[PDB]
Write a protein that binds this DNA or RNA. Structure first.
Length: 96
DNA sequence: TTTCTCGTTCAGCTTTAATACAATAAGTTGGAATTCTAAAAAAGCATTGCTTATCAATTTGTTGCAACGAACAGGTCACTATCAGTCAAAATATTGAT
């Protein structure tokens, strides 16, 4: 699984950047994105996807184990709509 | 046989044209880097029955990665004694007067 460790190492052998800043950029990368989502801003990354924010209302739910119907509290989640470019590169993938 | 016959380079001289001397004021020519802009590519537009994701409440295996504890630099201040620099000690050479 791709981790921040592998991402930093990549920037070291592709951009020749020290692992230090290579590890600091990967952190600030996801950080800045999370700061935009929490602030209520859409994140549109061309050639990748789009992190949307939809306010879901309180809908009926339950306890998957027993079956006790419990109303799922409303909350703002963070969806991800992959671009057409990304889909065309993952359409022919393979779980490995 | 013996004599008539010309072009070359050497060397000590003489003569014909361009460039002088300097500080001053730009001009040329190969790029480098920031920013305007048309050229390209990804995405919104457009829509509907059918397909797929939405997720609580709680137990159990998994894992990214910060949290620290040392070691290897990374960068600045001190150890330890005399260089680094400039004035006086100590008495007469040298210079001035009898």
């Amino acid at each position: 699984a791709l981790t921040k460790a592998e991402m930093s190492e990549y920037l070291f052998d592709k951009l020749g950047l020290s692992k230090r800043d290579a590890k600091e950029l990967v952190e600030l990368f996801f950080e800045e994105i999370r700061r935009a989502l929490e602030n209520g801003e859409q994140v549109k990354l061309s050639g990748f996807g789009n992190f949307d924010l939809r306010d879901k209302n309180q809908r009926p739910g339950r306890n998957p184990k027993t079956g006790e119907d419990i109303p799922i509290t409303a909350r703002r989640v963070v969806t991800f709509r992959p671009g057409q470019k990304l889909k065309s590169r993952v359409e022919n993938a393979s779980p490995k």
